[PDB]
Write the structure tokens for this entry.
Amino acid sequence: KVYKVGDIVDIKANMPHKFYQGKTGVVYNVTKSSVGVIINKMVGNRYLEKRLNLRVEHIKHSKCRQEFLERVKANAAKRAEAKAQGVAVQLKRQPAQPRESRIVSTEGNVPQTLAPVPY
Amino acid sequence: KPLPKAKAMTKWEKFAAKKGIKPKERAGKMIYDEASGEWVPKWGYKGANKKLDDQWLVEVIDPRTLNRAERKRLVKKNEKQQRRNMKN
């Protein structure tokens, strides 16, 4: 783990002193013994930046921008195919949908009735 | 050997005595830390001074090293003042 000026990291302390503990910011300095991050804090209804100076081992890289890249590459593939042929490809995602009709079967599964228990 | 006598006022015993600064009671060496809940020697084991050294974030060059330097400057100034007084 070696960090560069500008990358993104999250704070994770391995007690009662201070708790950001799970925010996400950009490295704006890398000194020998530590690293420095900035964090936009909601000062009432404004975003004013605090410059925190963490240590080395209390910070790790982030994967909050891996799915975007992987999906853009999968979309490159899908669009290569959609130009290779005349195909409706429907790249857009979709929110989870309501289910459809079904027919359950009580052959090896007879419904067992159960009542609530006492005290 | 002659009898022992060495009466220097070191300019602190002069300043403190022109006005009415009395000495301190010299009761104890512990303070009370609030979060945590221990008695944490003020100097004598992980003294409250050497705490900004291992703090897990400082909230603003590394500020902890600058703090160490600023402490060392006062230590060396105290030693120099003592040497000057002893030379007087």
